[PDB]
Amino acid sequence: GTSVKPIFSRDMNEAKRRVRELYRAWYREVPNTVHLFQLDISVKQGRDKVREMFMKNAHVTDPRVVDLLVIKGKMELEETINVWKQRTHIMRFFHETEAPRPTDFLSKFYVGHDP
Amino acid sequence: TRPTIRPRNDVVHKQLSAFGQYVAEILPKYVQQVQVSCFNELEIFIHPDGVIPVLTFLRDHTNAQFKSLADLTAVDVPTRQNRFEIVYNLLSLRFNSRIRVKTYTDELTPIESSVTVYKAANWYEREIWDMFGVFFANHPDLRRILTDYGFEGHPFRKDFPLSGYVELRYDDEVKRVVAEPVELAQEFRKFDLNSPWEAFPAYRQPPE
Amino acid sequence: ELVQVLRRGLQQVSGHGGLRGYLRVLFRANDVRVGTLVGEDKYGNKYYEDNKQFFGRHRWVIYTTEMNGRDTFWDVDGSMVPPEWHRWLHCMTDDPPTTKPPTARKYIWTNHKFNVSGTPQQYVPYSTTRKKIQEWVPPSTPYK
Amino acid sequence: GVRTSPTGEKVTHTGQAYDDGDYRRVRFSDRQKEVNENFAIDLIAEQPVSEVGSRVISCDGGGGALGHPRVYINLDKETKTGTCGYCGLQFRQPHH
Amino acid sequence: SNLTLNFGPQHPAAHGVLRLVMELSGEMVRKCDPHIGLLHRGTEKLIEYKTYLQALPYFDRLDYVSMMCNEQAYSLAVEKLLNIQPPPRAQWIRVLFGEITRLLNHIMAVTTHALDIGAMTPFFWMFEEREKMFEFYERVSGARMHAAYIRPGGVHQDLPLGLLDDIYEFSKNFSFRIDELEEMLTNNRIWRNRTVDIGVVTAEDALNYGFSGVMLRGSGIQWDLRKTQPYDVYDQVEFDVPIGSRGDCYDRYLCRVEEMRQSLRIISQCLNKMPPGEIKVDDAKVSPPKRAEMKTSMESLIHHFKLYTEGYQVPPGATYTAIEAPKGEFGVYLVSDGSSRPYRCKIKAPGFAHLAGLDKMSKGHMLADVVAIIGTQDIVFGEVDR
Amino acid sequence: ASKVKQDMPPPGGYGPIDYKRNLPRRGLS
Amino acid sequence: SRGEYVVAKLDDLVNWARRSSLWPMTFGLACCAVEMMHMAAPRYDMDRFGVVFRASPRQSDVMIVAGTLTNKMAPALRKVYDQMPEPRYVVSMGSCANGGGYYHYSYSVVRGCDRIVPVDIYVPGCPPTAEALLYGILQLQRKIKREKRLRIWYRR
Amino acid sequence: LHHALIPHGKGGRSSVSGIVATVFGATGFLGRYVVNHLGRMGSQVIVPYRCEPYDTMHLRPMGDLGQIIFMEWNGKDKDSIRKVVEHSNVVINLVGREWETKNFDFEDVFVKIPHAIAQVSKEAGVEKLIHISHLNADIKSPSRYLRSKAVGEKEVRAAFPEATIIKPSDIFGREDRFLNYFASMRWFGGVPLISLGKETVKQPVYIVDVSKGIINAIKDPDAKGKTFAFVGPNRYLLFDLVQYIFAVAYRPFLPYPLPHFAYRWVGRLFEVSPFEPWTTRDKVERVHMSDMTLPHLPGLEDLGIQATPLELKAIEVLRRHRTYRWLTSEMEDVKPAKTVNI
Amino acid sequence: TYKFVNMREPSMDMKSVTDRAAQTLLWTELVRGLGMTLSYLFREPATINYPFEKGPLSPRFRGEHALRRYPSGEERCIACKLCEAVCPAQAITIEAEPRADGSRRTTRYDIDMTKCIYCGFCQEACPVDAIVEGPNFEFSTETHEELLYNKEKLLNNGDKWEAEIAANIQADYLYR
């Protein structure tokens, strides 16, 4: 049994339903974010970025972890809708000033010691 | 023994012990332990499920009347299966007394919000959520309070690094403030200070 | 008692050496009070006291017009005061260096320097340690 | 005791001086390199050796509580002077 | 919809760094949402990375209007965990400088409150007195505000030979400055119009919202930590606790002025009853020895070395220690694991709970009324954000 | 080995210090 | 040459007008703002030098960064700096604003405000005394006395 | 490789990149981007400046402590160049002016100064020199500006044989004189275009692409004596480009044809300004001249850079030129213009 | 013991009622405030004439750091690293080695003045009075780098300010 208590969801089905509701809300919100913050990206770029964030935590199989992730996503959406975030906060998702780092062994061997 | 040593008060110690026994007798369902420190502070260790009843009793009981919540914070002890220790400090103006209530939780277990008992809890729980990642159920409005917008992690956890993972600067190409991985010109220097000789024999632990 | 104030003003005018010195001190320091001379720097600063003034205005300095290399007729700053007169002027002691000279040391600077920031002489930081790792030097002779 | 280097850079008392190939020298262009002129090693070498008539002497650096912690120095070795570990002052017993 | 406005952080009336997001209907305030953390420096984790002596200067910068009071609270917590007792002269010095610090804080609060409401002159009149008290601070410690003077052994140094005379000279005249400020503000009809019946809070709501200090006393609650839970020598001084009856801004302003007068009274008593003796505990495993002994005797040098490198160990245990700071109850929850570095140090700032109640207090008021209510809560964000 | 010298109040005590409110009436009817 | 003399005199006039009328923004962060207020207090009376606080960035000439700059606060400080009309000057006051100070190793603190805005004068101290801040302001006035805008324009 | 110049760190602000670069003309349009890119990875940057130091302040936050060093220099003084290149392993030349001043003309800024920089850098032992020319540089070009560019590139090659020459074409960006120049022409009400702009083809290139190309040329061992051509991915007729610029700015477009001699007269009239001229006769000629195609030269793609199209970066420049009504319009609204590609 | 601040009741006789009516209609308390401001107008201001006049300080004042010497010219610092250990801001960096004459001296002594909090803990910890907080407070710079002090700068500060530092230490060491 392992005797654990829930946050919101009983199993993975309800957790997936909450995930889908959060995704719908973010997808609806993206064009308003592009308009209000005067972003130079397109709506497609924003929705692709939204999709990318969800995919990152796709592997998780625990309903409590999924519930907490949905709570955090709702908090982030609330920050975005009320314009508590600024333009810099929204653009931090895109890492525009970070130089790309190669994943190949040779590139890493050449630059430094880090694995 | 006289000049440099703090004097102790035994009347307050006896009174606090009696009241601890009183509270433990009234609420056997939730009270796991009662302690009185030797500088006359009374603590009550409870099961998490009794956060709301116990507090309510202490707030509304005629003989308790702890109607002020002085502080509410968390302590992180990674070696415990339940990582986080939740501490309520209560003050009774009627009886001019103080009491401490303690419980525990882990990363995935919610604790019931005590805003219905004390209004002051509203921000404190938010801080606990921001700094430690402990979720409070039925909180009217739970979100970050201290950290920057979009900040990732809970900085008051023991395994969170002191300087964090990201740092901010102004970039002229994008004409805005940007975040990057932390790089320090001078690394913070860790000091190994503990003496290899035991200081306090009264706190020695059995050799297992 | 108005005539007393006016005569006080006329005496203030005449105590700066006439109209020229009075205007010079009026335009250099924005103040025309006449005090008692306590001492003079080797750089040219003059020090005055007037114990009837309230605490803070009872001691002052009239800066020199020419310190080490720069013209200080208009450009003066508080870092032009040498340390002994610095101790007297900030009321950290009652005894001026004229009556209570500092202890002489062979390593104390004989010439005070003011703040040098924004100039060629400014301080530039650098590491004061030697090289840590020594590299192998290959031989200068061919190997075959 | 400040000496110059082949590039003209002044040598500090710790002995630091940039090599000719070192690019960091560029930080001193149109500015100056701050060097203290009073080398403490030469100054402490200038002090005379005290002669005392006891096997053990005591040193506190002068000025009482304004000096260093008081230490005791043994002067049994005839072909050597006893040196203070804080001050650098030297003591000996009369010989010859 | 309502108009949404950013009040601060770059605002004269924001008391530093505060992002008040207000929802307004016209100039009526429908909702206040305080956003804080613009001065969150992560003090508690940093303290977790220091020895007990190294962490003391952080309490100077928590509430940078009442420095020695925070030093006193932290020192009392460490003393309780150490099971040691400061000497009497140190305790009398602590209470004297705590009352001087309360005078400084109350001057700042009242004058900047009046400045925000629109009266600028009393600020200028009283900041000269603030500068003289800064001179007292510097003469005792070498720093004008961040003294680091009060330490878990007592105080760092004894008083200079002429300090008490100057403190007496200042104290015998401060009451006339209080009188001039009162003549400017207390009976002015514009001041009363801007303060009376503004930000009324009931006693029960004040208790349940976690209020403390004047924010309780203005509503008639008869509470004061110096009278009910005295700490150093506060049981040996006589003073009255001012109590309000309306629970509004005007009553709290009157309470603060009366508390300044009571502070002058306590300062007089402390000046007359200063005893002789040492100024830190005569226990070299806690308090550092004198310099002359450290340069003369082996044990003194060893203890100086160890206290300045590793620091003293504190027996394991947890305490909650609170004081009546000028802004309300100031507390420390300090946990020791037996080593020379604290395991956890939670700081309780009265401004935290006071600002959390801003939305309740602003119901049915206007923008200028909210500015006055901000001033009446006596908020410094160094302690609110920590 | 002279007498202990410390910052102390003078023999007897300091003069009394006023602290009460002082707002004279100062007006006609 | 006549043009050299005329442009030099006009430079002197404009520089004097700018340094004699320095209006800092009403902006403070932490402990150091208390010493700023004491510098505005009667004993030092910065207003006697021509230094007057004004709330609006549009009516300000100098920004005094007096206190710790957090990561949450940095975009707002950059925004109010950008909204200052030019010429504008920045004065860094205290260790926190200078390089981080007591909170240099914190996760939420910018390590010196010069990572966000360019700085003209650094004032050391924790906090610097009101006298030290006044010294820094006068040093900025002397620095403004030294600029050669019209002479360099004529040299072009 | 001189141990102190061995790269260390992760490539961030506090890292060591092993680059010591002297950037002439670093206080201009391209200079700020080049200095920012060098300071991002922890290079030691030397900025020779002739202007008022107040105008260099925006370059101060671009580097860690001690990584950006400012020094005065004179373009006509060899010792200043010697002083500012004595310690660098890379010298970049971004010196240029769109108009001629009473003290410096095109021959001074595009031939004499680059030649002096190249010669002194070669004598000092600098191993890498980057020289910026124009894609349209021609010895027989009608424009004075282009002819001096060609002569200067020849002299730079003569003085520093192992130099890398980069020829961009009409860089556009926030502080440019290309999109801003055409947007500002709304103040006259109509847009005068020679032959209605229907016989001019442009291939504009993004500023960040040029800066990244300079950085990659610095870090490319194969680019020693190479000549590159930095151009954008699309070619546009001038009429279509100006129409798109006015559409992104949401301003009414009123193009009318002006004869060449009349436009030359207007350039003459505007040249008389003692300040920065609004336009010049040389500028008018350059605007109306088609961009050259040089397929034999390597380009941005040979340095690992995918050229950014104008359609993704026009809004960040032209949103400033909109009125309040059109300020919030998104970037995918303005129907990208037609390209004459192949 | 407690007192009330706002618990008085006005008199309801004709005399007091007419006095309050006169105060309402003739602005008496506002005139009193105007009189107070007029009184302050004719007082001597508290402003001092900086920089020709200076604010008062004490020998305990903590300012710019300096490294000191013995009267022979030998440095006092023996590289014990107590100041480095105690510094609350980690503003001090020390490297040391045996000197050519076998002495225990530093090869690196750095203070980051933009990290320092000017608490004076280093001078309390020092057992030979080598590192001190001097009396100087007017050392603002134009760049960040000028505030990163090395050993040469600190020794120069000591040689520059010893004449005042020794006198200041003489006035306070009996309290230490």
Ligand SMILES: CCCCCCCCCCCCCCCCC[C@@H](O)O[C@H](CO[C@H](O)CCCCCCCCCCCCCCC)COP(=O)(O)OCC[N+](C)(C)C
């Ligand atoms: C016609 C209407 C339009 C134009 C309006 C112009 C207004 C008239 C010009 C006003 C001139 C007054 C300025 C002179 C006062 C300077 C005082 C003196 O002190 O300045 C010194 C040197 O002054 C400057 O170097 C030169 C100032 C003036 C330069 C030449 C005068 C040019 C006037 C031409 C006017 C024409 C205007 C253009 C018409 C189109 C430097 O000292 P300073 O740093 O201050 O003080 C230090 C503070 N201390 C003393 C307390 C220690």
Ligand SMILES: NC(=O)C1=CN([C@@H]2O[C@H](COP(=O)(O)OP(=O)(O)OC[C@H]3O[C@@H](n4cnc5c(N)ncnc54)[C@H](OP(=O)(O)O)[C@@H]3O)[C@@H](O)[C@H]2O)C=CC1
């Ligand atoms: N922008 C474009 O469309 C493309 C640019 N070109 C070339 O790219 C280079 C840089 O372009 P860009 O940034 O736009 O030009 P800018 O006008 O923005 O700046 C050019 C730099 O050269 C300096 N400079 C100019 N003249 C002199 C001089 N007589 N003496 C000393 N320094 C001087 C300027 O300094 P100061 O501020 O003091 O005057 C300035 O820093 C130039 O060589 C240009 O020819 C290549 C294709 C087109």
Ligand SMILES: COC1=C(OC)C(=O)C(CC=C(C)C)=C(C)C1=O
């Ligand atoms: C009277 O002029 C002044 C102000 O304008 C009203 C201020 O805001 C301030 C800043 C203090 C408030 C609380 C913003 C000061 C110090 C001042 O002197």
Ligand SMILES: COC1=C(OC)C(=O)C(CC=C(C)C)=C(C)C1=O
């Ligand atoms: C004491 O409380 C405080 C204020 O209220 C008086 C402030 O205005 C400010 C800052 C705003 C002005 C411009 C100093 C700060 C930092 C502060 O701490």
Ligand code: SF4
């Ligand atoms: S530098 Fe010191 S006084 Fe200034 S804000 Fe930071 S901690 Fe406070």
Ligand code: SF4
């Ligand atoms: S004064 Fe304090 S913070 Fe500064 S170097 Fe000394 S110990 Fe460190």
Ligand code: SF4
């Ligand atoms: S300055 Fe003093 S405490 Fe610091 S290393 Fe030197 S001798 Fe030790």
Ligand SMILES: [Zn+2]
């Ligand atoms: Zn010795």
